[model samples]
Target: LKIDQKIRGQMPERGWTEDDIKNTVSNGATGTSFDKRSPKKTPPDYLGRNDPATVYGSPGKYVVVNDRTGEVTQISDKTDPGWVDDSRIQWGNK
Candidate 1:
């Protein structure tokens, strides 16, 4: 079967429709197509610092790094410092 056939075949079996899917993603959500979307795409798991040694990173302590001078920012569970995913990050080890 093709994509269309496969989907149509399973729609009634699954008891949902394209409109249902559209509704599923709207107003609230359903468990579809968002697995790749980060639940919270905050700062990356990596950064643009030199390395993840003591200076740049410390395990269990959240840190925000950029260049060679981003202080280990204190997050209130979701603290906001000037961080983004656009930085060319250098992988660091804890």
Candidate 2:
């Protein structure tokens, strides 16, 4: 018997419809139908620049994390002359 027929025969006494078999086969088989997504571009000094505010001239400390080690590190010093209160800053146009 064909694959579909074999699958239908193995179903419960309640039986399965053609739609059920089609859905099962379609979802069970897996392979990408298109090319993979492209990777994002990284800057040469990307490690030192996480916050747009500091990179674009706004004064603030940019905090970064190391995913592998689970360590938190600050890109900018808290006592830096350009440091500003991040919590008090507005996110977008009010």
Alpha-carbon lDDT, every model: 0.28, 0.30
Runs of candidate 1 with Cα error greater than 4 angstroms are 1-3, 28-94
Candidate 1 per-residue lDDT, tens place, 1-94, comes to 0123434554555444455443322433111111111323323443333323111222221223221232222211112243342222233531
Candidate 2 positional error at 80, Å: 1.5
**TM-score versus the correct structure, for each prediction:** 0.26, 0.21
Clashing pairs in 1: none
Every candidate's CA RMSD? 19.5, 24.1
- The candidate that achieves the highest lDDT relative to the unseen native structure: 2
Residue 81 lDDT in model 2? 58
For model 2, residues 2-85, the per-residue Cα lDDT tens digits are 222323443432243445434433443221111111233222323332221211112343322222322222122434555453
| Whole-model alpha-carbon lDDT for candidate 1 | 0.28
Model 2 Cα RMSD, 1 decimal: 24.1
